Design an enzyme around this catalytic site. Structure first.
Site, PDB file in Angstrom:
ATOM      1  N   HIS A  41       0.823  -1.243   0.000  1.00 36.07           N
ATOM      2  CA  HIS A  41       0.000   0.000   0.000  1.00 36.07           C
ATOM      3  C   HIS A  41       0.851   1.286   0.000  1.00 36.07           C
ATOM      4  O   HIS A  41       0.275   2.375  -0.181  1.00 36.07           O
ATOM      5  CB  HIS A  41      -1.019  -0.020   1.125  1.00 36.07           C
ATOM      6  CG  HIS A  41      -0.489   0.147   2.514  1.00 36.07           C
ATOM      7  ND1 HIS A  41      -0.457  -0.909   3.399  1.00 36.07           N
ATOM      8  CD2 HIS A  41      -0.136   1.246   3.219  1.00 36.07           C
ATOM      9  CE1 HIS A  41      -0.007  -0.491   4.572  1.00 36.07           C
ATOM     10  NE2 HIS A  41       0.189   0.827   4.490  1.00 36.07           N
ATOM     11  N   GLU A  72       0.860  -8.410   0.706  1.00 34.84           N
ATOM     12  CA  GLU A  72       1.035  -7.021   1.228  1.00 34.84           C
ATOM     13  C   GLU A  72       2.515  -6.701   1.419  1.00 34.84           C
ATOM     14  O   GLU A  72       2.798  -5.645   2.001  1.00 34.84           O
ATOM     15  CB  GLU A  72       0.209  -6.836   2.506  1.00 34.84           C
ATOM     16  CG  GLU A  72      -0.008  -5.369   2.894  1.00 34.84           C
ATOM     17  CD  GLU A  72      -0.639  -4.472   1.836  1.00 34.84           C
ATOM     18  OE1 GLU A  72      -1.305  -5.017   0.908  1.00 34.84           O
ATOM     19  OE2 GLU A  72      -0.383  -3.242   1.886  1.00 34.84           O
ATOM     20  N   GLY A 146       0.853   5.357  10.810  1.00 38.14           N
ATOM     21  CA  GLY A 146       2.247   5.849  10.780  1.00 38.14           C
ATOM     22  C   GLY A 146       3.265   4.782  11.162  1.00 38.14           C
ATOM     23  O   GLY A 146       4.475   5.053  11.014  1.00 38.14           O
ATOM     24  N   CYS A 148       3.149   1.651   9.798  1.00 35.94           N
ATOM     25  CA  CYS A 148       3.239   0.699   8.661  1.00 35.94           C
ATOM     26  C   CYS A 148       4.696   0.650   8.197  1.00 35.94           C
ATOM     27  O   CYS A 148       5.326   1.722   8.076  1.00 35.94           O
ATOM     28  CB  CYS A 148       2.262   1.033   7.542  1.00 35.94           C
ATOM     29  SG  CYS A 148       0.545   1.043   8.121  1.00 35.94           S
TER      30      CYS A 148
END
Length: 182
Positions: A41, A72, A146, A148
């Protein structure tokens, strides 16, 4: 404060950079040579900022399992003038549960941040932001926006990167040794 935080600090001090894309600032784990990982992402493009330096992306691959399900994790090769310490020998070979993990973050917003998240479950399937995702690890810590890209470690193992949360739990994508065979 203890040997868990000692291992986490050793990984942060040598194997992380601050990555900036159009979607924000992320903790980015360097694994070996010029190869790093980031949550998919982050939407990595042709150019990324590494510690505020404009850097060409030589290759970027959004990983999926052999059911063609999102993992992911994006693997990025950076046009950087310096190699990462090779930490592939700290990656697990198989999907597993863990005791006593630390989530570590380093950005402009959250410098030198270390969180003892405790027990980590092999959760498996998660609908992550509406996207079916496999190989998810879960910890009972209220993770915030924040974090990630944050690195999940136990003593002697680098087991995942933080990719989301629901306000009560946090979720990480597994890192497996087989992702980084060259």
């Amino acid at each position: 404060m203890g040997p868990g935080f000692d291992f986490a600090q050793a990984i942060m001090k040598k194997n992380t950079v601050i990555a900036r894309t159009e979607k924000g600032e992320f903790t980015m784990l360097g694994v070996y040579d010029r190869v790093a990982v980031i949550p998919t992402h982050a939407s990595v493009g042709e150019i990324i900022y590494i510690n505020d330096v404009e850097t060409r992306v030589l290759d970027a691959c959004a990983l999926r399992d052999l059911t063609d399900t999102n993992l992911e994790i994006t693997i990025v090769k950076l046009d950087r003038n310096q190699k990462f310490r090779d930490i592939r020998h700290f990656l697990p070979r198989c999907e597993d549960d863990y005791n006593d993990a630390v989530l570590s973050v380093h950005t402009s917003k959250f410098p030198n941040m270390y969180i003892p998240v405790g027990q980590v479950t092999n959760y498996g399937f998660l609908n992550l932001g509406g996207t079916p995702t496999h190989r998810i690890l879960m910890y009972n810590f209220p993770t915030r926006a924040g974090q990630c890209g944050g690195v999940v470690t136990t003593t002697g193992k680098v087991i995942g990167i933080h990719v989301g949360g629901n306000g009560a739990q946090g979720f990480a994508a597994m890192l497996l040794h087989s992702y980084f065979t060259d």
